[PDB]
Amino acid sequence: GLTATLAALTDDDFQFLSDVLDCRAVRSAMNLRAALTSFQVAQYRNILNASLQVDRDAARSRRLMAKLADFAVEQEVTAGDRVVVIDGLDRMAHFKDDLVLVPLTTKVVGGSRCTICDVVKEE
Q: Which DSSP category does 31 fall into? A: B
CA 56, CA 52: separation in Å to the nearest integer? Answer: 8
Q: What are phi and psi of 60, to 5 degrees?
A: -65, -40
Task: Tell me the one-letter amino acid at 39.
Answer: F
Question: What total of structural domains would you count in the chain?
Answer: 1
CATH code of residue 69? 3.30.1330.220
Backbone angles phi, psi at 103, to 5 degrees: -50, 125
Contact 85, 32 (CB under 8 A): yes
The DSSP letter of residue 8 is -
- Rounded to a whole number, what is the distance in angstroms from the first to the last CA of the chain? 38
Strand order in the sheet with 99-108: 25-27, 82-85, 113-121, 99-108, 93-96
Beta carbons of 52 and 65 less than 8 angstroms apart = yes
Range of the domain at 94: 1-123
* Elucidation technique: NMR
CA-based diameter of the chain, in Å?
Answer: 44
> What Cα–Cα distance (Å) separates residue 18 from each residue in 12, 66, 94, 104, 108?
10, 11, 24, 15, 15
